[PDB]
């Protein structure tokens, strides 16, 4: 009953789940002379493990990428959050053109995709879902995407996207390693926020990175190739599957650094 189209989009998201417009609510407008910088803050660790990776899914809103949960070894740390919180997938979200795609925008300013990393308190919560619902049982690391040179490990991911252009296809996808999609600085931005899309849960703890990452507009483009639509319907490219900018209603914007 939700997408991002004219009629189902995020301006109309309120009417099927009220928390729409709540006091957590994802993503913002990061206006960077206003974050705090909390030098009390752990150093951000992302402990990737190379082949934890199972498969990669059309599910209808996204590109997703699931992960084996199963145990400890594929987490983030440190930053805010207390203790480990393990890697269950990440998906991304992307413009129709260039100038839109991100969810958070810095300074007003939006990039042209953005990857999101779904971490979950597993040492506490006894299911993502369960989790999901906690006020500390998430933790999504986003990264921004920025058109430029090509990305040599993207070139795996977007290989694979033709095999999963419909909605609701899936195909194996092993030894992938999340790592390979990570700026080189851990500098961050970290808020008490939402899911961003429905049900809009206030259970993340966003850690948004800093640097963006650079893929080719040919890399770019195969994002664009996926379709929101099944295999026999009508072709509707996924294209603008973002959620604007909700109000920060008096939340602290964290810093890592000093802009
Ligand atoms: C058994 C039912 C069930 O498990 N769910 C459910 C289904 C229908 C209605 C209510 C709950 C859940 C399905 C997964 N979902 C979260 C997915 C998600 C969404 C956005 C991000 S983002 N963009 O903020 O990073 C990250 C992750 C939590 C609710
Ligand atoms: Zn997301």
């Known amino acids: 009953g939700w997408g991002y189209g004219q009629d189902d989009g995020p301006s109309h998201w309120h009417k099927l789940y009220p928390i729409a417009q709540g006091d957590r609510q994802s993503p913002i407008n990061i206006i960077s002379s206003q974050a705090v910088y909390s030098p009390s803050l752990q150093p951000l660790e992302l402990s990737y493990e190379a082949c934890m990776s199972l498969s990669i899914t059309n599910n209808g809103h996204s590109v997703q990428v699931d992960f084996n949960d199963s145990d400890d070894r594929t987490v983030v740390t440190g930053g805010p959050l207390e203790g480990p919180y393990r890697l269950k997938q990440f998906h991304f979200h992307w413009g129709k053109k260039h100038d839109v795609g991100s969810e958070h925008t810095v300074d007003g300013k939006s990039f042209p995709s953005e990857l999101h990393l779904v971490h979950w308190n597993a040492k506490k919560y006894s ?70 899309t429905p049900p809009l849960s206030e259970s993340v703890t966003w850690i948004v990175l800093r640097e963006p990452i650079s893929i080719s507009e040919r890399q770019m483009g195969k994002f664009r190739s996926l379709l929101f639509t099944s295999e026999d319907d009508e072709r509707i490219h996924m294209v603008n599957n973002f959620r604007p900018p909700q109000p920060l209603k008096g939340r602290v914007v964290k810093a890592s650094f000093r802009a």
């Open 127 to 196: 299911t993502f879902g369960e989790a999901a619902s906690a006020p500390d049982g998430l933790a999504v690391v986003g990264v921004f995407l920025e058109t430029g040179d090509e990305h040599p490990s993207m070139n795996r991911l977007t290989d694979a996207l033709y095999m999963v252009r419909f909605k609701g296809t899936k195909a194996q996808f092993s030894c992938f390693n999340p790592k390979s999609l990570l700026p080189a600085s851990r500098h961050y931005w970290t808020y008490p926020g939402s899911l961003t």
